[PDB]
Design a protein around this ligand. Structure first.
Ligand SMILES: [Zn+2]
Lengths: 397, 245, 397, 397, 397
C-alpha cells in the first residue's frame, strides 16, 4: 500500500517537476527517486484484472534510467521520460482498480490483489518516498495503532431515514401527537406535532424528544442548529404506520421552547446547549439527543384563537421543529462526505467493470446500507478501498 | 554470513552480486549489493553530444557510506567454521578500508568531479561498446589508491582543459572533413563512370588520413563495410557544387 | 509562533518522509532541519499547563542527532527517529493547547503561554523552516503589517438574527405589512408580506427593503440568489413584538418584483444586480441591501381573485422573498466557515479542559456573540488561537 | 503432514521468539531451524486451490537465510524475518485449507492435496522440528501402531436421538407404559413412565431398561449420574408412533428404584453402579445399560392415594428417570467436543468456499450423521482434516 | 507490556527449570536471559500502588548475576537464585495489580501505571524473550493491527435478560399469546406460548420469533440446539409488565414445528438450519434469529382434545420452546467464559483492595453491564487488564 502510494506519487512528481527548461537542481532528487523506481520494477512481471469485466493484463518492465548531469532539462529529456511515465501510470491505474474491486470478509486491511501482494514484498520497500496525503498518513498511523483522524466537510454519517412516531393516535387519525424526522447525510430535520395544541396537556406543554445514535464517534464537529423543520411545514398525506390507510397533516408552525440539544458519548453528556441556535460545537459524541416542546400560547389574537379550538375538530395542527446540520467533523473511521470523491470512485469502478457482489460490501456500494451496518470488517475494507482510490486519484482525473 | 558458496554458472543472465542481493537478508550488505548491481552509466545528450553520466550518489560520494556500512557488518560478522586467525585477518582487512570512510568519500567525489570536467571537453558521442582488447587494471593499484589517497584536491588546469578540448575538436573536424573528401571522391567516380576505380584505395586514404589507424591491419570485411557506408552518405554542398561545375 | 509552526512542520515531514526503505536523498534536507531542531532544543526546559484541568507537564530535551550515513533508510533508523518524534509531537501538542486556552485583552497577538514566550527568544529562531501554510503566511503578513487574506467556503459572517418588523400594524394583527428575516452563517432569507396584497397601495406596489451589515469586509465573494424565502412560506404563529400576544401569518407566495441586490462598501455602491438570480459576484463590500416589491397582479383568474379581496377580512397574506447565500469569500480577518475545524478545535480544547471564562472571548466561545461584537482585541486573540489550532491540527488528526 | 506441522511450528516459534531486543542466544536454534526450512523449500513450486471457490494460487520460494550476527535482535532483523514469515504463513494457511476441503473414500489418511502430496516427498524431510501438539503426537503414534488417545471434555459421542417406546399401548393412549429418552452430545436423559403406577404389575414393580451403544470405545470416562430426568418431567402433547394422532403425558415423578448403571465392553460388564449417584468412573466400555424400576409406594398419604387410583382414568402418570452426562473421556478415535473447535473450523472452511458434497462426509459435515455412520473411511478422513485444522489454527486466529 | 510479560516468562522459566541437579545445558540460555534481565533492571527505581488500599511500594534492583560455573545446579545455587527470584516475582505481581486496578477513558489500551509506563521505555526492550501465550500473542497482533482471536468455552456473550413479550393480552391475563425467554452467559432459552392453542389462528399456526443480537462477532462457533425450553415448562406466577398484578402460566409442551435458526452477519443470513437439532456450526455471525411455530395438532386423542377447548376458559396453555447453547467459539475481543479465570482475577483484585469505581468499568466489574454496554473504550481497557491478569497468573497461584 505504501509502495503503491509511492509509485503513484513518484509518477505525479515526474509529471509535475520534470518539465522542459527547469534547472536540474530542482529535480535531481526526484530523478534519483524515479530511477530507483525503475530499477526496482525492472525485471518483474505483474498480472492485473480477471475479476468481472476488468481485463486481464500482463505488465513487464525494462526501461532505461534518466540522466543526472544536465544543467537544464530540455525537450529530449522530457520526451524520453514521458513514455516510461505513461506506462507506469497505466500500470498503477490498473493495480489500483484491481485492488478496489476486491474485498475480504477477514483480513480486510491486507492487500487482496495479486499485484499488491507482490508489491508488499520487501525488495519493493526501496520505493517508499514520502507518505504525505491524509489517507496514507492515517493508514500508516492506524497500522502503528496510533490515534488517527479524517476531516470531513458534511460527513455522510446518518443513513437515510424518513419516518414518524405517534405517541397519541387512533384509527381516524384526526387527533394525533408525535414526531416526524428525516435523517440524511449530515442533516437532521425533526418536527413535533400535536393536533390539540396542548389544550389538555399539563401546563399546556407537550414534550418531544428525538435520539439519533451515530454509527461512529465524531469529534471536533461544528454544527448549525435552526428552530424550524422546513421539510415538515406543509400539508401532507401520509401512509399510516402499517400502510393500511392515509392521514392528513396540516401544520401550523410555532416556535419550539425549552430547546436543548445534548451530544453524548457512551451515555455521558459531553455537550449540552439550551435554547442556543446557530453555530455550536460538539467535541466528542456518538449520540445526539434533541429535546424541544410545544407550549400553547397563553395569549392569542382572534385569528390564532380561531385556528386553535378546544373541541375535537382540529383543522390546523400545531408543529415545532429543529434543523441540525453537521458542517464539518473529524472521525477515526473513514466516511463519505461532500468534498471527497472516493466513494464515487470505488462505486464507479465496480459498476463500470460489473464486479460480482462480494461477501462484505452491499451491492453497488450502497452507502445507506453500508453506514447502517458499518461493522469493523466493513470499516477495514472501506478504508483500504478508499486509500487505493485516493492513490489512483493522484494520477487519474 | 555462513551461506554455502555460490556455484555460479557462466553465461547466467544474472551476475554473482545480483544473485547474492536477493539471497542475503542483511540490510546493509543487501542494499550495497543492490546499488552495485543497478549502478551503470546513464546516457544523456548534452549540447548535442552523448555523455555517459554517473549516479548522483557516487558523484557526491554518498554511496561510500553504504559501502562502509556493509564492510562494518562484515567485520563484526561471525564467519562460521572459518579458522580464527584467518577470520581475524579478513575482518581487520575489512576494517582497514572501513576506517577510511572520509578519505574514500573524498576520493570518490574527486574522481567523479575530474571525470565530469574532462567529459565536458569531449566532442564525439561517448558510445559504449565492449571492446576486443581491454585495458588491464590492477586491483593492487586500486588498493594503493584507496589506502594512499590523501587530502589535497587536484583538478584539471584550465589550460589542460582547453588543450584536451582543442585536441578533441581537431580530431572530430578532421574526421568529418576526411569523410567529406572520401564521399566526394567516391560519388564523383561513380558519376563519371570510372568503373575501373577501386574504392578500397579511397577508403585506405581515408583511414590513413585519420592518423590513428594502422591501415595495413584493418580486416577486409570491415574495409568493405566502410566502403558501403561511405557510398550511402550525401555529398557535402561545396564539394558537390564544384563537381557540378 | 513561527518557531512553533516550524516544529510542527519538521515533525510532520519527519513522520511523512522518514519511512523504511526510502532513499536518503529524499530526506537529506529534512534530516538537516531535524538535527538543527534537536541541537537548538537540547538543554532547554519547558513547562506547559497549570490552567483549568490541563495537566502541568515538564519537558526536557536530550536527543542524539539522526544518522546521516545511509543510502536507504531501514527499520532501525525509522524506530530511532520515531522515538524522538513521538516526544516532540507530544510537546508541540501540549504547547499548542496551552497557547489556545489563554487570552488577554491587550497584546492579544503576543504569545500567552510560558512555553511560547520562551520559544519567542532569539536562540530558537534557528528553527524556522518554511512558513507555507495559509494561516502562518497570514500571521507573518499581519506581523509585518501587510494585507492578509483568508479564503472561506460559507463564511459564518452573519450574526444569528431571526426577527420581523411590522411597518403597518394594529392590536388585532389582522392587516399587517412588514418583513421577516433570518440571517445565519452565510444565508440571508428575507420575506416581505402584505395582508392587503397592495389593494390600496400606490400603483398596487408595496416596497420592501432589508439591510444586512457585516462586521468585516468581504471581497471576491460568490453568492447564490434565489427568488423565494422558503423559510417564511408556511403558516406561522408568531409572538408579538412585546410578547403580549401571538399573531397568525398565512402566506401566499408571489414572485418578487423589481428585485435589486446592492453590495456596498462604506456607503458606496460597489456591485448592483437587478432581476438577476443564480450566481453573482461581489468584489468588495461590507453591507448588503436587498430591495424587492410586492406587485398586486393586474390580471387574476377566479381562484386568485377569491384569494385577494378588497375588504378587511384578508384570509391569505401576500408574501414575496429572497434567499441569498455566500458560497465563497475572502476576508482579511479570520472567520468561522463550514469546512475548517479551527473554531471547533479551540472550543473543544477549552471545554475538555474546563478553562474558566476569560475576559476576551464570550462564554463557551459562542461564535454568535463573537461575530456580533468582533472587536479588535477579540480579532487578535482569535487569530492567535486559530493559528495555534491549525499548527496543532498539522500533527494531531 | 509431519512436514506441514513442522512448518507451522517453526513459523509460530519464529513469530513468538524473533522479537526486537531479545537475546540472540534465545533464538539461535530456532534460527537454524528457520534456515533449514528456507533451504529445503527454496526452488520448489507449489499450487493450492482449484476446488469449490477456493482460489488457485501458485507459490515460489527464493528466500535467503538469516545470518546477521548480533547480541540482541534489532528492528532490521525482525523485519527481514517477518517478510519471509508472512509469505510462509500464507502458504501454510492455503495448504491446510486445500487439504481440509478434500476427501477420499479409499486411503483417507493419505494426503489429498497436491501440495501436501509433494511435501510428503523425502527431500522435504529435513524440516521436522518437534511434534509436540496432541494431534500430531497421535498422528505419529498411529503411524507407529502404538495406542493413540484423545481427551475430550463433554465428548459428542451420542447421535441426537429423541424417541419413545410404548411397551403397552391402546389407540386412545389413555393407559401407557414405556420409556422416553433423549440422547444428545454427552447426555442421556431417559424416563420410564407407567400410567397405572404398576397397580397390577408383579410385586407392584415395573422395570424399564435403556441400552445406549457407542460408535467408539471410550476409556477413563468420568460421568455424572443424577436420579431425575428434567426433560421428561413436564406435561407434554406427543405425536404417536405412526404420527396419525397425539397423546397426553402428565407425569408425576417418583424416585427411580433399584437403579443399576452398567458400562459394558463386548457384552461383558466392565463397570457397574447400583443405587449410586454423583460422579462415577467407567474405565473402558462401548455400551451403557441403564435399568431402573417404578415401585408403587407401599405407604401413601391421602394426597398420594388420591393421585394414584386403581381404576382406568389416570390423571397423573407415574414417571421415573435418569440423567447421565459424560463430563470427560478418552477415545482412540477423534470426536467433536465442547472445548475444541476443529469440527467448527473444517465445517466453516467448507461452507465459506462452497465445497461440493464429497464422497465421504455427509452434507454440511452434519455431526449427527457422521457419528451415526462413523465408518472407518470417515474416521480416517475426519482425523486427517482435524489434524490439518489444528496445524492451521497454530498460525491463524 | 511485552516487557512485563517477558519478566513474568523468565521468572516462570527460572522457577520451573532452575532445580537442584539439573544439568547446566538445560538452563544455559535461561541463565543468559536471567542475567540480561538483571543487567537491564539494575539501577532503576520503581514505585507501585497508591490507588485504593493498594500499598505504596518502592522497588530497587541491585542484584548480582547468577553463576555459570556448575555442571549441575546444586542446593546452594537454587537458594541463591530463589532469593532474587522472589523479589522479582513480588515486583512483577505488584506492577500487574497496579495496572489491573486502573483504567482510562482515552487511550485505554495504553499503560496506566507508572511502573508499566517506565517499562515501556526503549532501554527495557532487551528483556523481551518469547511471546508464546495466547493473550500476549493477541496483544502483539492487535498492536500490529493484525488478526486477533480468542477461543472461548461457553463464552459469556449474552447479557443476562429474563423477560417476556405479550402480543395478545388483557387485564385478566387468561388468554395470552407471547414469548418468554432467558438469555444468560452462553445459553438462550426461549418459549412461545399461546393460551388458545391457535384455535382461531390462520391455518392453526401461531408464529414466534426471537432475535438475540450479540455485541461482538463470533466465528467458528459450535452450538447445540434442543427442541424444548425446560425453564418455561412448569406452572408459575409472573408479575405483569407494569408490575400491577400477577398472572398464571400453566404450560403444556408441544413440539415446535418449522424451527429455523439463522446466524446473521450485518443482516445477511450466513448460516441457516431448518428442523435440525443437536450440534451445528455458525462460521461467522453477530445475530441469532430463532423462528418457531405452535401448530395445533390436527388429530388429537380425547385426552389431548380435552386440554384445548374452543371457548375462553383455557386451563392448559400450549407452549413450544427452543434451547441454544454456544459450547465453543472464537472472538476478536475478550470475553468472560467458563474456563478462563481472568475476569475473576481482575474483579478479585479490585474487590480486595477496594478500588473506587472508575470512569470506564461498571461498579464491581459487573459483567452483565459490561457486556450490555461493551463500548470500544471498555473493550480496550478490558483487553489490557485481562492481558495483565494472564501475565500475573503465571507467577501467582
Ligand atoms: Zn464445560
Amino acid at each position: 500500500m505504501d509502495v503503491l502510494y509511492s509509485l503513484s506519487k513518484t509518477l505525479k512528481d515526474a509529471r509535475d517537476k520534470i518539465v522542459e527548461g527547469t534547472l536540474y537542481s530542482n529535480v535531481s532528487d526526484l530523478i534519483q527517486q524515479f530511477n530507483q523506481m525503475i530499477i526496482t520494477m525492472n525485471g518483474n512481471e505483474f498480472q492485473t484484472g480477471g475479476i468481472g469485466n476488468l481485463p486481464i493484463r500482463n505488465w513487464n518492465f525494462n526501461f532505461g534510467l534518466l540522466g543526472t548531469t544536465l544543467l537544464n532539462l530540455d525537450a529530449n529529456y522530457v520526451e524520453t521520460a514521458r513514455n516510461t511515465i505513461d506506462y507506469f501510470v497505466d500500470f498503477v491505474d490498473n493495480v489500483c482498480m484491481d485492488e478496489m474491486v476486491r474485498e475480504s470478509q477477514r483480513n480486510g486491511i491486507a492487500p487482496q490483489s495479486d499485484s499488491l501482494r507482490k508489491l508488499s514484498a520487501i525488495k519493493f520497500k526501496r520505493i517508499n518516498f514520502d507518505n504525505s496525503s491524509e489517507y496514507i498518513e492515517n493508514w500508516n498511523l492506524q497500522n502503528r495503532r496510533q490515534r488517527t483522524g479524517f476531516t470531513f466537510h458534511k460527513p455522510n454519517i446518518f443513513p437515510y431515514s424518513a419516518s414518524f412516531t405517534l405517541n397519541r393516535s387512533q384509527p381516524a387519525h384526526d387527533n394525533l401527537m408525535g414526531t416526524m424526522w428525516l435523517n440524511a447525510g449530515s442533516e437532521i430535520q425533526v418536527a413535533g406535532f400535536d393536533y390539540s395544541c396542548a389544550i389538555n396537556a399539563p401546563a399546556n406543554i407537550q414534550q418531544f424528544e428525538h435520539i439519533v445514535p451515530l454509527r461512529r464517534v465524531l469529534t471536533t464537529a461544528t454544527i448549525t442548529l435552526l428552530p424550524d423543520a422546513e421539510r415538515f411545514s406543509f400539508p401532507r398525506v401520509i401512509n399510516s404506520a402499517d400502510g393500511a390507510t392515509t392521514w392528513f397533516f396540516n401544520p401550523v408552525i410555532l416556535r419550539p421552547n425549552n430547546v436543548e440539544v445534548e451530544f453524548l458519548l457512551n451515555g455521558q453528556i459531553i455537550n449540552t446547549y439550551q435554547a442556543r441556535f446557530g453555530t455550536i460545537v460538539a467535541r466528542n459524541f456518538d449520540t445526539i439527543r434533541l429535546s424541544f416542546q410545544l407550549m400553547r400560547p397563553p395569549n392569542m389574537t382572534p385569528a390564532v384563537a380561531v385556528l386553535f379550538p378546544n373541541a375535537q375538530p382540529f383543522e390546523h395542527h400545531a408543529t415545532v421543529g429543529l434543523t441540525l446540520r453537521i458542517e464539518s467533523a473529524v472521525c477515526e473511521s473513514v466516511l463519505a462526505d461532500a468534498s471527497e470523491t472516493l466513494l464515487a470512485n470505488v462505486t464507479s469502478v465496480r459498476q463500470e467493470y460489473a464486479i460480482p457482489v462480494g461477501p462484505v460490501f452491499p451491492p453497488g456500494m450502497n452507502w445507506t446500507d453500508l453506514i447502517t451496518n458499518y461493522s469493523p470488517s466493513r470499516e477495514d475494507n472501506l478504508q483500504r478501498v478508499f486509500t487505493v482510490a485516493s492513490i489512483r486519484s493522484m494520477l487519474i482525473k | 554470513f555462513g551461506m554455502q558458496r555460490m556455484h555460479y554458472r557462466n553465461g547466467d543472465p544474472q551476475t554473482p552480486f545480483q544473485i547474492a542481493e536477493q539471497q542475503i537478508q542483511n540490510f546493509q550488505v543487501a542494499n550495497w549489493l543492490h546499488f552495485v548491481n543497478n549502478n551503470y552509466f546513464r546516457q544523456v545528450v548534452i549540447d548535442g553530444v552523448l555523455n555517459q553520466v554517473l549516479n548522483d550518489n557516487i558523484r557526491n560520494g554518498h554511496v561510500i557510506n553504504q559501502l562502509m556500512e556493509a564492510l562494518m557488518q562484515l567485520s563484526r560478522q561471525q564467519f562460521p567454521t572459518m579458522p580464527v586467525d584467518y577470520k581475524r585477518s579478513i575482518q581487520r582487512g575489512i576494517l582497514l578500508l572501513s576506517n577510511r570512510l572520509g578519505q574514500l568519500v573524498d576520493l570518490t567525489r574527486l574522481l567523479a568531479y575530474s571525470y565530469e570536467t574532462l567529459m565536458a571537453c569531449v566532442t564525439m558521442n561517448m558510445q559504449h561498446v565492449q571492446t576486443l582488447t581491454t585495458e588491464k587494471l590492477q586491483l593492487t593499484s586500486v588498493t594503493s589508491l584507496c589506502m594512499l589517497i590523501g587530502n589535497a584536491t587536484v583538478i584539471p588546469s584550465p589550460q589542460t582543459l582547453f588543450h584536451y578540448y582543442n585536441v578533441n575538436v581537431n580530431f572530430h573536424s578532421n574526421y568529418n572533413e576526411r569523410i567529406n573528401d572520401a564521399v566526394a571522391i567516391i560519388t564523383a567516380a561513380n558519376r563519371l563512370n570510372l568503373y575501373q576505380k577501386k574504392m578500397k584505395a579511397i577508403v585506405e586514404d581515408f583511414l590513413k588520413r585519420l592518423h590513428i589507424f594502422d591501415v595495413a591491419v584493418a580486416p577486409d570485411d570491415q574495409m568493405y563495410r566502410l566502403r558501403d557506408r561511405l557510398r550511402l552518405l550525401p555529398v557535402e554542398v561545396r564539394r558537390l557544387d564544384i563537381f557540378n561545375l
